[PDB]
Design a protein around this ligand. Structure first.
Ligand code: ZN
Ligand code: ZN
Ligand code: ZN
Ligand code: ZN
Ligand code: ZN
Ligand code: ZN
Lengths: 8, 137, 137
């Protein structure tokens, strides 16, 4: 599974 | 709210998962999470309804399918899906290390798309599609 | 939802806030909320009883004072209180954007701690300490 960080 | 220690109690079998909000840890459960077994508070419902299918410029959902937030997330590789699950929800609800197991898994079908339906404490509702459309009106 | 709807009528002066439960918005008011002017239902009293003075590892209360839940929260900046108030309740009951303005001030004295006592629809009962001792039966 690829990951990302969000836009908190 | 304090989800970690509530889920700890669920795991010890001394609290019912359906009596906590699995989206934030609130004890003021007035409804049901439409995708998974577990409760939901009105705040969390208002957030879901608000960040309903918002998308980032990468073509994926901005927020976690479980908590409607999240810092680092896993992304599903199943075309018509594009859902995200944050590592915090996965490690808490599925179990410690499951996120890294899933990141190593190549490719990855997310808990909404899997055949299995149950993953640790995270249990997909058989009638999620009916419940989901009903959730949005 | 339920709460958000009734709070609008309170704003339109079509409802008395004493006749609604300010934690879940039920019309089934059993009692007077002990801290703020407004009703309460028996379900929310139980939450309130179970939630009271529980703490997280950062030293503040685990649950929002009003809804016994909370996603994003404001944290009170004095050692005798340590209460949290979530963003949704603040926006609902003081008014839209009040939460954003409150994050923009150090230190933050909460609604139980400020000397004003009235912040939008949020109305501190003058005799709250006594109502609070009674409340814990
Ligand atoms: Zn919640
Ligand atoms: Zn999450
Ligand atoms: Zn998927
Ligand atoms: Zn209530
Ligand atoms: Zn709240
Ligand atoms: Zn305070």
């Amino acid at each position: 599974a690829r990951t990302k960080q969000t836009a908190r | 709210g304090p989800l970690g220690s509530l889920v700890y109690e669920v795991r010890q079998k001394c609290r019912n998962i359906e009596d906590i909000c699995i989206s934030c840890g609130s004890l003021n459960v007035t409804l049901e999470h439409p995708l998974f077994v577990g409760g939901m508070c009105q705040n969390c419902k208002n957030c879901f309804l608000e960040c309903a299918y918002q998308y980032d410029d990468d073509g994926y959902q901005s927020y976690c399918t479980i908590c409607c937030g999240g810092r680092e997330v896993l992304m599903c590789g199943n075309n018509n899906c594009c859902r995200c699950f944050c590592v915090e929800c996965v490690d808490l609800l599925v179990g410690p290390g499951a996120a890294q197991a899933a990141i190593k898994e190549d490719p990855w079908n997310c808990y909404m798309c899997g055949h299995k339906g149950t993953y640790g404490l995270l249990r997909r509702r058989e009638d999620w599609p009916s419940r989901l459309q009903m959730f949005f009106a």
